[PDB]
Amino acid sequence: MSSLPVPYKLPVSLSTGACVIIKGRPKLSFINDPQLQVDFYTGTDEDSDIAFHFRVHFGHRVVMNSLEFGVWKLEEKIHYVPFEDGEPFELRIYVRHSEYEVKVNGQYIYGFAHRHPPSYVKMIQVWRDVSLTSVCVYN
Numbered sequence: 001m002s003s004l005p006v007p008y009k010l011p012v013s014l015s016t017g018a019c020v021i022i023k024g025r026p027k028l029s030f031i032n033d034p035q036l037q038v039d040f041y042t043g044t045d046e047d048s049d050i051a052f053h054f055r056v057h058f059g060h061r062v063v064m065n066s067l068e069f070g071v072w073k074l075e076e077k078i079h080y081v082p083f084e085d086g087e088p089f090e091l092r093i094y095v096r097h098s099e100y101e102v103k104v105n106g107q108y109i110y111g112f113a114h115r116h117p118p119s120y121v122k123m124i125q126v127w128r129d130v131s132l133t134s135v136c137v138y139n
């Protein structure tokens with residue numbers, strides 16, 4: 001029941017081989033339609049673009065996208081992701097040469113083809129209805 005502040009922001013540097021590990025817990029029950037959002041920004045300003053947007057509608061679906069010149073682009077969705085109601089989760093995002101690889105709770109979930117070079121990602125924001133245990137960037 002320790003937590004980072006939410007919304008949480010940190011500066012980052014991403015390269016091939018890097019891994020973002022996010023651990024926390026939904027802060028509300030699923031019947032309350034809670035959400036989790038992770039945004040990889042290509043700048044440090046409020047109005048910077050988002051190279052990778054990962055949004056969990058707990059109990060319903062996951063959507064992924066990018067924000068480019070202020071426009072949401074092609075939405076990619078996952079019907080089922082194994083987040084458990086009331087349980088802690090572990091989310092990992094690996095930076096590969098051609099895609100981000102998304103892992104949740106020991107399962108491979110998705111490969112998101114890059115739309116922007118990861119070298120341009122400058123900060124990450126993790127927010128909405130979560131308590132956050134830790135946000136680590138490796139390599």
Ligand SMILES: OC[C@H]1O[C@@H](O[C@H]2[C@H](O)[C@@H](O)[C@H](O)O[C@@H]2CO)[C@H](O)[C@@H](O)[C@H]1O
Pocket residue numbers: 053055063064065072074075076
């Ligand atoms: O694509 C990410 C983007 O989704 C918007 O919401 C979408 C919603 O996901 C979709 O089911 C519906 O058909 O259209 C909505 C508007 O495009 C969010 O508004 C936005 O914040 C992003 O999360």
